[PDB]
Design a protein around this motif. Structure first.
Motif, PDB file in Angstrom:
ATOM      1  N   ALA A   1      72.036 -11.802 -10.954  1.00 58.04           N
ATOM      2  CA  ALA A   1      72.176 -12.600  -9.739  1.00 58.04           C
ATOM      3  C   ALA A   1      72.624 -14.017 -10.069  1.00 58.04           C
ATOM      4  CB  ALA A   1      70.857 -12.619  -8.971  1.00 58.04           C
ATOM      5  N   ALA A   2      72.010 -14.624 -11.083  1.00 58.54           N
ATOM      6  CA  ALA A   2      72.384 -15.975 -11.478  1.00 58.54           C
ATOM      7  C   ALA A   2      73.813 -16.012 -11.996  1.00 58.54           C
ATOM      8  CB  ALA A   2      71.416 -16.501 -12.536  1.00 58.54           C
ATOM      9  N   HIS A   3      74.219 -14.988 -12.743  1.00 61.18           N
ATOM     10  CA  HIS A   3      75.580 -14.957 -13.259  1.00 61.18           C
ATOM     11  C   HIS A   3      76.583 -14.812 -12.125  1.00 61.18           C
ATOM     12  CE1 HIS A   3      78.950 -14.583 -15.731  1.00 61.18           C
ATOM     13  NE2 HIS A   3      78.562 -13.649 -16.581  1.00 61.18           N
TER      14      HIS A   3
ATOM     15  N   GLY B   1      67.410 -25.425  -9.764  1.00 58.54           N
ATOM     16  CA  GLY B   1      68.276 -25.181  -8.626  1.00 58.54           C
ATOM     17  C   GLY B   1      69.117 -23.935  -8.809  1.00 58.54           C
ATOM     18  N   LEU B   2      69.642 -23.735 -10.018  1.00 58.35           N
ATOM     19  CA  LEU B   2      70.374 -22.506 -10.300  1.00 58.35           C
ATOM     20  C   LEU B   2      69.472 -21.294 -10.132  1.00 58.35           C
ATOM     21  CD1 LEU B   2      72.415 -20.485 -11.298  1.00 58.35           C
ATOM     22  CD2 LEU B   2      72.217 -21.445 -13.581  1.00 58.35           C
ATOM     23  N   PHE B   3      68.225 -21.388 -10.592  1.00 57.68           N
ATOM     24  CA  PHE B   3      67.311 -20.258 -10.433  1.00 57.68           C
ATOM     25  C   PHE B   3      67.050 -19.957  -8.963  1.00 57.68           C
ATOM     26  CE2 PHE B   3      63.127 -18.176 -10.443  1.00 57.68           C
ATOM     27  CZ  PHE B   3      63.426 -17.117 -11.268  1.00 57.68           C
ATOM     28  N   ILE B   4      66.836 -20.994  -8.155  1.00 61.72           N
ATOM     29  CA  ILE B   4      66.596 -20.778  -6.731  1.00 61.72           C
ATOM     30  C   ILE B   4      67.837 -20.193  -6.071  1.00 61.72           C
ATOM     31  CG2 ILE B   4      66.051 -21.885  -4.541  1.00 61.72           C
ATOM     32  CD1 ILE B   4      63.629 -21.624  -6.414  1.00 61.72           C
ATOM     33  N   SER B   5      69.021 -20.659  -6.471  1.00 61.75           N
ATOM     34  CA  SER B   5      70.252 -20.104  -5.919  1.00 61.75           C
ATOM     35  C   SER B   5      70.407 -18.643  -6.315  1.00 61.75           C
ATOM     36  CB  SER B   5      71.451 -20.922  -6.394  1.00 61.75           C
ATOM     37  OG  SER B   5      72.625 -20.544  -5.701  1.00 61.75           O
ATOM     38  N   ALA B   6      70.036 -18.308  -7.550  1.00 61.89           N
ATOM     39  CA  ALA B   6      70.074 -16.921  -7.990  1.00 61.89           C
ATOM     40  C   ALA B   6      69.121 -16.072  -7.167  1.00 61.89           C
ATOM     41  CB  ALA B   6      69.723 -16.832  -9.474  1.00 61.89           C
TER      42      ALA B   6
ATOM     43  N   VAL C   1      65.906 -15.807   3.799  1.00 66.19           N
ATOM     44  CA  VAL C   1      65.211 -16.505   2.725  1.00 66.19           C
ATOM     45  C   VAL C   1      64.639 -17.783   3.316  1.00 66.19           C
ATOM     46  CG1 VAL C   1      65.339 -17.281   0.343  1.00 66.19           C
ATOM     47  CG2 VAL C   1      66.992 -15.617   1.208  1.00 66.19           C
ATOM     48  N   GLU C   2      63.328 -17.952   3.201  1.00 69.72           N
ATOM     49  CA  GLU C   2      62.638 -19.149   3.660  1.00 69.72           C
ATOM     50  C   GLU C   2      62.278 -19.971   2.433  1.00 69.72           C
ATOM     51  OE1 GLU C   2      63.001 -18.798   7.038  1.00 69.72           O
ATOM     52  OE2 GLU C   2      63.791 -16.975   6.103  1.00 69.72           O
ATOM     53  N   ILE C   3      62.994 -21.071   2.242  1.00 66.00           N
ATOM     54  CA  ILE C   3      62.652 -22.066   1.237  1.00 66.00           C
ATOM     55  C   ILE C   3      61.795 -23.116   1.928  1.00 66.00           C
ATOM     56  CG2 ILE C   3      63.541 -23.497  -0.623  1.00 66.00           C
ATOM     57  CD1 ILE C   3      64.584 -20.654  -0.773  1.00 66.00           C
TER      58      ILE C   3
ATOM     59  N   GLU D   1      61.000 -30.479  -2.460  1.00 63.71           N
ATOM     60  CA  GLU D   1      61.495 -30.501  -3.830  1.00 63.71           C
ATOM     61  C   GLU D   1      62.337 -29.273  -4.148  1.00 63.71           C
ATOM     62  OE1 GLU D   1      59.661 -32.258  -7.121  1.00 63.71           O
ATOM     63  OE2 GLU D   1      57.778 -32.688  -6.080  1.00 63.71           O
ATOM     64  N   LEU D   2      62.066 -28.139  -3.500  1.00 62.62           N
ATOM     65  CA  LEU D   2      62.921 -26.976  -3.713  1.00 62.62           C
ATOM     66  C   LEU D   2      64.330 -27.235  -3.196  1.00 62.62           C
ATOM     67  CD1 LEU D   2      60.462 -24.076  -2.864  1.00 62.62           C
ATOM     68  CD2 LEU D   2      60.476 -25.678  -4.772  1.00 62.62           C
ATOM     69  N   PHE D   3      64.440 -27.838  -2.012  1.00 60.47           N
ATOM     70  CA  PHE D   3      65.749 -28.232  -1.506  1.00 60.47           C
ATOM     71  C   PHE D   3      66.407 -29.239  -2.435  1.00 60.47           C
ATOM     72  CE2 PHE D   3      63.521 -27.088   2.533  1.00 60.47           C
ATOM     73  CZ  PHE D   3      64.279 -25.969   2.802  1.00 60.47           C
ATOM     74  N   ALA D   4      65.617 -30.163  -2.983  1.00 56.89           N
ATOM     75  CA  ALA D   4      66.164 -31.149  -3.908  1.00 56.89           C
ATOM     76  C   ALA D   4      66.758 -30.467  -5.133  1.00 56.89           C
ATOM     77  CB  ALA D   4      65.075 -32.141  -4.317  1.00 56.89           C
ATOM     78  N   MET D   5      66.036 -29.496  -5.694  1.00 50.51           N
ATOM     79  CA  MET D   5      66.553 -28.766  -6.847  1.00 50.51           C
ATOM     80  C   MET D   5      67.818 -28.004  -6.482  1.00 50.51           C
ATOM     81  SD  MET D   5      62.669 -27.732  -7.953  1.00 50.51           S
ATOM     82  CE  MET D   5      62.995 -26.021  -7.514  1.00 50.51           C
ATOM     83  N   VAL D   6      67.826 -27.358  -5.315  1.00 47.70           N
ATOM     84  CA  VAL D   6      68.978 -26.554  -4.918  1.00 47.70           C
ATOM     85  C   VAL D   6      70.212 -27.435  -4.773  1.00 47.70           C
ATOM     86  CG1 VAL D   6      69.950 -25.199  -3.025  1.00 47.70           C
ATOM     87  CG2 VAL D   6      67.646 -24.705  -3.875  1.00 47.70           C
ATOM     88  N   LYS D   7      70.071 -28.570  -4.088  1.00 41.86           N
ATOM     89  CA  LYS D   7      71.218 -29.456  -3.920  1.00 41.86           C
ATOM     90  C   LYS D   7      71.639 -30.056  -5.256  1.00 41.86           C
ATOM     91  CE  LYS D   7      70.649 -33.759  -2.397  1.00 41.86           C
ATOM     92  NZ  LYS D   7      70.353 -34.613  -3.581  1.00 41.86           N
TER      93      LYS D   7
END
Ligand SMILES: [Zn+2]
Lengths: 104, 235, 342, 263, 104
Positions: free
Chosen positions: C55-57, C263-268, C318-320, C324-330
Motif C-alpha cells: 500500500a505504501a509503495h 505521514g507516509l504510513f498514514i497515507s498508506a 477513513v476517519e482520521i 497531529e495525524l493531519f499534521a503528519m499527513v500534510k
C-alpha cells in the motif's frame, strides 16, 4: 435481546458488525459486570485492617493460578492486587492435571 | 536510582519465538522498549535510562534480567514451528502501473522469481512455540509492565519485522531470591566467562543491544529452556 | 522524532485467511496456531506488513506519478528496493554494521525505505500480528465442491454441439475411470503407510521406495486422461479463516519516526482502506477488514502513553481523528524532496 | 587464508587446480564469501553468473563455479561441455578434515555414476544419499576439526557463508547451502556425541518402546500431544532416562531423532 | 503546604496510599467541568480520603459546597457515625469550618 437491540442500533447507525460480534461484545461487557459484582462480593470481607478472611470460591470456572490461559482469566482481578501472592499459593479443592510432568 | 525488587514476568506467547542462538534476554527487550519510548537509538542514553528501571551488575557488567525461559503447561509444551517469510510478488507488484520493465519486441521481460538477485526469498527460521514465556529481573515492576504492555517489543529475533513471539497478558509477580544472573551456580543469562558461572560458551556483547559492541567471550544458558508454569508461579 | 504506537482492533468484514507452508499440512489448511491444533490461531504480522508495504509503495508511486511517456519512473532495481528491499543490481549504500543510526540521508530521501527497511537498513515500522480476542473465532470456511456445469443445469447442454456433447461424455467417462483407479492406488498407498508403523529399517526402506512409485503411477494415470488431466467434480478443501466480525487485537508501531515518515504510513493506511484486504482467497471476498487504531505516543522522558489520535478504517470511509495525524499527513504531502530513484 | 572456504578448497576442490587459469588482481571483496581482499593477497577471479552480475570469487571460492567435465564428468547430457560444478551439486555432501587437509565426498549413486574414474583418484567417494550422510557420520570415526557440508546445493554464496569448522563431536555444523544465520544454526547443528550416547543407551529398550519413544517425542516437539500425555507415555514405558538425555530444544530433539531413525 | 503537616500533626494514622488518593482527588477537583474516575479499594479510606480534599479546596474560594452522595443507607451513617469528630478535628487544624448537612 440486549444483543439484538445493540445490533439494531449499530445497524441503523451504519456500523457493519455481525450479530455474533455484538454477542461477543455484550458477553465481554457482562463479564466485566460480573467481575465488578464479585469484586463487591469479595469486598464484603476485610472491612477492617485487622480482619482476616478465608475466601472460598467453589466455582469450577474460577481460573486456577497455574491455568493462565483460562477463558475467564480476568476473574483473577477479583482478588485484590496486594493479595495476588496469596492467589498464587492457594489450596485447590479439585486441581486438574495434578501430577509431576517429566518434560520439564 | 530507584528501589528495585526481584520480579518474575510471565507472558502468554502468541506467535513462535525465534531465538538468535543466544536466548533473548529481557534486558534486550527492555532496551528496545526504551528505544521506542525515548525517541533515540543512541546506546548510551537508552542504557542510562535502562539502568533506572533495571538493576545493573557493575562487577559483572550485565543487567539483572534473566534469559528467556519457556513456560510450558501440561496442556501445551515447547513446540517446533518455522517462522516463515516469503516474498509475495503479486500481480499488482508485477505490473507496469508500478514500474517500467525493460521491453523487447514490445513484451515486458518477466522477473525471474525462480532464483537470482530478484528471487522469491523463502527465508525459514526455527522458532519455539511454547504456551508462555518467562523472565526474571531485578527492576521496577511499574516501568517494565508499562513497557511490555505498550511498547512494540517481542521475544525472539525479529518482533519488529516478522512479528515473531508476540506476547500479551504480561503478568509480574514478586520473587523471594534474585534469580536473574545466577541460579545455584548456573547462569540464567549471558555472563562473562570469568564470573565462574557454568553453562554454554558463546560470543556476544554482555550489555544490549546485542548486535553492537565487541563480541567478547561469555557463558549463556541453554538457548531453549523449559519450565513448568506451576513451578514458575511458585516464586 | 516520535514513536507512534497504533494499538487497535481489526473487525473482520469477511473471513480472514492466510496460507502458511508450516501451518498448511496434508490434513488440511490451518492457520498459524503457535502450538497444537487446540490452540489460538493468529493472523501473521508478516502478511499485514507486506500488505501495508505494498500500500505504501502504491502511495509512493501515485505521489511520484508517471513519466511524460506514461510509464512509471521506477525500474526493476528501484521497484524491488521499494517493494521488498532486495538490491538486485548490487548498488546500495552498505551501511556500517555497528552504527545504528546509519542512512539518515537515505531515510530522509526515501521515507518508504525508512518506514519499512531494506536489506541492511532496519525498518522503522513494526507490524504485529492480529491476535483474536476470543476462544472460538476461527472456522473451516470456503470448502464446497466444484460441480460439473452440465450435470447441474441441464439447460446449459442446449448450447453444446453434439461433437462437444460427446466430448463431455468422454470427459465424464475418463473422470470416472481415473477416480476408480486412483482411489484403488491410494488405498494401496494407505495400506503401505499402515505397514509403515510396524516396520524396521530394512522393510521401511523397501516400502517407502514403493509409495513414491505408487504416486508416479497415479501421475501417469492422470496423464493418461486424454480429455482432462484433473477431475472436474472436485470437492474443494476448506481453508481456515477468522470468523466474520472477529475482533483481532492488532499492535503496530513506528519507531523514532519523523512526521513525514508517519505521514507516509498514514497515507498508506488510507490507501489500504480503498481495498482493506488481508490475506488470500480473495475469490470469496476474504480479507475485508475494518480497523480502529488508537495512535499513541510516549511522553518525552516519562513512560506514559499520550493519545495523539485515532485511525478508523471502515467501508464507509477513513476517519482520521487528532490534529497531529493531519499534521503528519500534510507534512508527508509536503517535503517533495523525497528521492525514490536512488 | 584461515577461513572456512580455504580449508575445504585445499582439501577437496584442489582437484580442479588445472581448470581455473591464473587469477586477476582485484580491488573489491569477494562477493561469494564476502571477506576482505586483504586476505586474498590482492588477486581474484572475475566472473559473470547466469544473472549477468559481475562477481569476484577468490581462489578457494571460484572453484565452486569451474567446469571440468574431463575430471568431474558431465552433469546434464543436454549441455555436454559443462561438467559437474562443486557449487551446483544438490544432494551431495562432504566431510573435510582440516588438520589432515583431506576430504571424503558423500555423493548419491547417480552422481558417482556420472563421475569419471579419474575423479576417485584424487578424492575418495562413498556412495550415500542425502539421508545416508548421517549414517556415515555416526558409524565412521570422525576427525576434528572438520568441515561437514551436507548439501552443496546451488546457492554457492549461502553455502560459503554457512561453512563453519566443527571443532569436536559435541557440535558438528552442517553446511546445507542455506545461509547459516544465528537464528537457524539449531537446524544445522548436529551433536554427534549426544546422539551417540543416546544410541548406546537405547539398546536397553525394546523396539516397541523405541518406536513409542520416538513417536511421543516427535509429536511433543510438534505440539501434537499434550505434555501430560507424553509424560504419561514415558512413565508407563519407563522412558525417563531417554528424555533426561534429550536436549530441551524441540528442534534439536527432532534433528537427533531424525539421525537416530537413520542409523 | 498545610497538606503534609495537617494529616500527621492532627494525629490521624494516614498511610502513603491515603496521601496518593487525597492528592489525586484534590487535583481532579481542582480541574473545572471534568470528570474524575478513581478506584479506591477498601482500606485506603473513602470517608476521609475525598473529604479532606474537599476541605483543602474549601480553604480557597470559600463560597462553594461539596455534595457527597453515598448509595448505601448505612454508609451515610458511616460518614457521621464515628468520623464526624475526626473531620471536625481536621477542620480545626486546617481551620475554617465543616458545616455538615446530613441530607436524607
Ligand atoms: Zn571468496
Amino acid at each position: 435481546m440486549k444483543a439484538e437491540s445493540l445490533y439494531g442500533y449499530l445497524k441503523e447507525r451504519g456500523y457493519s458488525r455481525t450479530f455474533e460480534a455484538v454477542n461477543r461484545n455484550i458477553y465481554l461487557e457482562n463479564l466485566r459486570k460480573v467481575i465488578r459484582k464479585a469484586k463487591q462480593s469479595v469486598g464484603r470481607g476485610i472491612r477492617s485492617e485487622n480482619d482476616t478472611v478465608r475466601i472460598i470460591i467453589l466455582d469450577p470456572r474460577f481460573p486456577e493460578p497455574t491455568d493462565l490461559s483460562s477463558k475467564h482469566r480476568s476473574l483473577e482481578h477479583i482478588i485484590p492486587v496486594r493479595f495476588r501472592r496469596e492467589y498464587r499459593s492457594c489450596e485447590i479443592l479439585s486441581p486438574a492435571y495434578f501430577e509431576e510432568d517429566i518434560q520439564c | 536510582m530507584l528501589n528495585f525488587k526481584p520480579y518474575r514476568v510471565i507472558m502468554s506467547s502468541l506467535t513462535p519465538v525465534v531465538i538468535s542462538g543466544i536466548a533473548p534476554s529481557l534486558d534486550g527487550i527492555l532496551y528496545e522498549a526504551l528505544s521506542q519510548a525515548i525517541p533515540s537509538n543512541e546506546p548510551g542514553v537508552v542504557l542510562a535510562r535502562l539502568k533506572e528501571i533495571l538493576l545493573f551488575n557493575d562487577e559483572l557488567g550485565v543487567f539483572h534480567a534473566s534469559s528467556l525461559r519457556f513456560g510450558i503447561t501440561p496442556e501445551q509444551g515447547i513446540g517446533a514451528t518455522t517462522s516463515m517469510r516469503c516474498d509475495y510478488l503479486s500481480p499488482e507488484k508485477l505490473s507496469t502501473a508500478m514500474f517500467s520493465p525493460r521491453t523487447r519486441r514490445g513484451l515486458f521481460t518477466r522477473v525471474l522469481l525462480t532464483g537470482g538477485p530478484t528471487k522469491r526469498r523463502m527465508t525459514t527460521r526455527p522458532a519455539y512455540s511454547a504456551p508462555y514465556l518467562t523472565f526474571d529481573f531485578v527492576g521496577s515492576s511499574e516501568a517494565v509492565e508499562i513497557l511490555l504492555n505498550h511498547a512494540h517489543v517481542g521475544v525472539g529475533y525479529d518482533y519488529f519485522s516478522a512479528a515473531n513471539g508476540e506476547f500479551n497478558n504480561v503478568t509480574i509477580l514478586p520473587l523471594d531470591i534474585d534469580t536473574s544472573i545466577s541460579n545455584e551456580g548456573m547462569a540464567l543469562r549471558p555472563v562473562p566467562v570469568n564470573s565462574g558461572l557454568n553453562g554454554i560458551k558463546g560470543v556476544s556483547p554482555l550489555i544490549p543491544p546485542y548486535f553492537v559492541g565487541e563480541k567478547l567471550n561469555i557463558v549463556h544458558p541453554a538457548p531453549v529452556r523449559t519450565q513448568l508454569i506451576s513451578s514458575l508461579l511458585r516464586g | 522524532m516520535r514513536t507512534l504506537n497504533f494499538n487497535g482492533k481489526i473487525s473482520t468484514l469477511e473471513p480472514l485467511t492466510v496460507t502458511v507452508k508450516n501451518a498448511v499440512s496434508t490434513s488440511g489448511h490451518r492457520l498459524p496456531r503457535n502450538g497444537g491444533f487446540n490452540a489460538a490461531p493468529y493472523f501473521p504480522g508478516t502478511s499485514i506488513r507486506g500488505t501495508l508495504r505494498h500500500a505504501a509503495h502504491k502511495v509512493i508511486v501515485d505521489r511520484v506519478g508517471l513519466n511524460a511517456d506514461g510509464k512509471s519512473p521506477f525500474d526493476l532495481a528501484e521497484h524491488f528496493m521499494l517493494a521488498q528491499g532486495v538490491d538486485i543490481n548490487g548498488e546500495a549504500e552498505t551501511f556500517a554494521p555497528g552504527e545504528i543510526n546509519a542512512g539518515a540521508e537515505l531515510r530522509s530521501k526515501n521515507p518508504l525505505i525508512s518506514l519499512f527497511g531494506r536489506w541492511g537498513l532496519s525498518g522503522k515500522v513494526g507490524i504485529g500480528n492480529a491476535i483474536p480476542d476470543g476462544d472460538n473465532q476461527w472456522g473451516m470456511f470456503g470448502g464446497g465442491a466444484r460441480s460439473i456445469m452440465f450435470q447441474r443445469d441441464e439447460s446449459l447442454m442446449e448450447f453444446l454441439e453434439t461433437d462437444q456433447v460427446d466430448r463431455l461424455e468422454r470427459l465424464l467417462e475418463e473422470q470416472a475411470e481415473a477416480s476408480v483407479d486412483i482411489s484403488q492406488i491410494k488405498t494401496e498407498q494407505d495400506a503401505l503407510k499402515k505397514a509403515m508403523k510396524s516396520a524396521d529399517k530394512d522393510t521401511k526402506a523397501e516400502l517407502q521406495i514403493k509409495v513414491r512409485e505408487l504416486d508416479e503411477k497415479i501421475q501417469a494415470r492422470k496423464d493418461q486422461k486424454q480429455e482432462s488431466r484433473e477431475s472436474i467434480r472436485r470437492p474443494i478443501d476448506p481453508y481456515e479463516a477468522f470468523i466474520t466480525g472477529a475482533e483481532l487485537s492488532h499492535r503496530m508501531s513506528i519507531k523514532n519516526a519523523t512526521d513525514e515518515e508517519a505521514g507516509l504510513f498514514i497515507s498508506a493506511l488510507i490507501r489500504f482502506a480503498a481495498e482493506p484486504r488481508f490475506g488470500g482467497h480473495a475469490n470469496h471476498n476474504c480479507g475485508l477488514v475494518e480497523a480502529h487504531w488508537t495512535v499513541t505516543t510516549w511522553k518525552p522522558g516519562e513512560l506514559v502513553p499520550v493519545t495523539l489520535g485515532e485511525i478508523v478504517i471502515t467501508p464507509n470511509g477513513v476517519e482520521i481523528t487528532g490534529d497531529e495525524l493531519f499534521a503528519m499527513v500534510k507534512a508527508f504531502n509536503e517535503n517533495q524532496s523525497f528521492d525514490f530513484t536512488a | 587464508m584461515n577461513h572456512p572456504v580455504e580449508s575445504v578448497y585445499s582439501a577437496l576442490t584442489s582437484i580442479l587446480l588445472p581448470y581455473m587459469g591464473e587469477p586477476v588482481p582485484v580491488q573489491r571483496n569477494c562477493s561469494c564469501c564476502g571477506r576482505a581482499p586483504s586476505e586474498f593477497d590482492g588477486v581474484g577471479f572475475e566472473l559473470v553468473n547466469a544473472y549477468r552480475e559481475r562477481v569476484v570469487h577468490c581462489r578457494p571460492c571460484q572453484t565452486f563455479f569451474v567446469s571440468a567435465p574431463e575430471l568431474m564428468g558431465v552433469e546434464n547430457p543436454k549441455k555436454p561441455t559443462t561438467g559437474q560444478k562443486f557449487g551446483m551439486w544438490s544432494g551431495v555432501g562432504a566431510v573435510i578434515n582440516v588438520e589432515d587437509n583431506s576430504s571424503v565426498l558423500l555423493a548419491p549413486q547417480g552422481v558417482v555414476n556420472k563421475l569419471p574414474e579419474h575423479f576417485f583418484d584424487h578424492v575418495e567417494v562413498i556412495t550415500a544419499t542425502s539421508g545416508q550422510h548421517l549414517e556415515y557420520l555416526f558409524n565412521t570415526e570422525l576427525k576434528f576439526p572438520l568441515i561437514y557440508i551436507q548439501n552443496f546445493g546451488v546457492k554457492t554464496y549461502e553455502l560459503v557463508r554457512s561453512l563453519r569448522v566443527s571443532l569436536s563431536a559435541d557440535a558438528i555444523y552442517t553446511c546445507a547451502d542455506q545461509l547459516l544465520t544465528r537464528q537457524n544454526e539449531v537446524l544445522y547443528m548436529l551433536d554427534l556425541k549426544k546422539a551417540k550416547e543416546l544410541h548406546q543407551e537405547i539398546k536397553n529398550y525394546s523396539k516397541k518402546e523405541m518406536d513409542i519413544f520416538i513417536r511421543t517425542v516427535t509429536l511433543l516437539a510438534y505440539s501434537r500431544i499434550t505434555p501430560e500425555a507424553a509424560s504419561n507415555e514415558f512413565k508407563k514405558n519407563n522412558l525417563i532416562p531417554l528424555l533426561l538425555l534429550l536436549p530441551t530444544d524441540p528442534h534439536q530433539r527432532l534433528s537427533i531423532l531424525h539421525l537416530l531413525k537413520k542409523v | 503546604m498545610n497538606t503534609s503537616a495537617v494529616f500527621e500533626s492532627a494525629g490521624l494514622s494516614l498511610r502513603k496510599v491515603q496521601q496518593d488518593y487525597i492528592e489525586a482527588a484534590a487535583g481532579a477537583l481542582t480541574q473545572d467541568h471534568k470528570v474524575a474516575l478513581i478506584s479506591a479499594e477498601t482500606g485506603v479510606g473513602k470517608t476521609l480520603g475525598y473529604l479532606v480534599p474537599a476541605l483543602l479546596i474549601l480553604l480557597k474560594n470559600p463560597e462553594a459546597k461539596f455534595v457527597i452522595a453515598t448509595n448505601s443507607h448505612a454508609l451515610m451513617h458511616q460518614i457521621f457515625r464515628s468520623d464526624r469528630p475526626l473531620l471536625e478535628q481536621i477542620a480545626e487544624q486546617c481551620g475554617i469550618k465543616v458545616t455538615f448537612s446530613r441530607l436524607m
